[PDB]
Design a protein around this ligand. Sequence first.
Ligand SMILES: O=C(O)c1csc(CCNC(=O)c2cc3nc[nH]c3cc2F)n1
Length: 167
Amino acid sequence: VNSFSGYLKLTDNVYIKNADIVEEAKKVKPTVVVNAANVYLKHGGGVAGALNKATNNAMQVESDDYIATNGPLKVGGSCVLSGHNLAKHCLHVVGPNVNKGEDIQLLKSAYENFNQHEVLLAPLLSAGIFGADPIHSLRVCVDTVRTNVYLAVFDKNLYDKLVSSFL
Ligand SMILES: O=C(O)c1csc(CCNC(=O)c2cc3nc[nH]c3cc2F)n1
């Protein structure tokens, strides 16, 4: 049993809810919240901008030190950093950004990072301002992630479309 509430069950291990991931993280304090990161960990907008704002920019400060030491992530890659006031840990995962021309096949590699964590609160990778089709992102998620993933979808209209079209 875990503390996630109000989710629709899509499969054995994937659950979904119309929710603001920031508010959901603040209430659950999950072990892992996933950020929709870019390779530079520049958390300017979308999910990343919202998560970072909720940490009062502490996420960005920590991220800048990480990049100064380690250099950029790979598209499809990830790193584990602090969850600050939102979670124990934040898994920063880089989905391909279609608006940068990045190969959508890397979306599966991005979701594979979730398998290193038994339970996660996450957004749909490469959705929103990353330009991919969220229906496709949900399909890749379901077909790739084997650990228990709680997906937060901010837009109610999109949430309803994702549920109604799910196979
Ligand atoms: O419906 C979805 O989940 C969806 C559609 S596009 C996309 C990526 C961009 N997300 C955001 O800008 C975003 C900003 C927030 N500010 C406060 N809480 C937020 C949650 C967010 F998700 N997510």
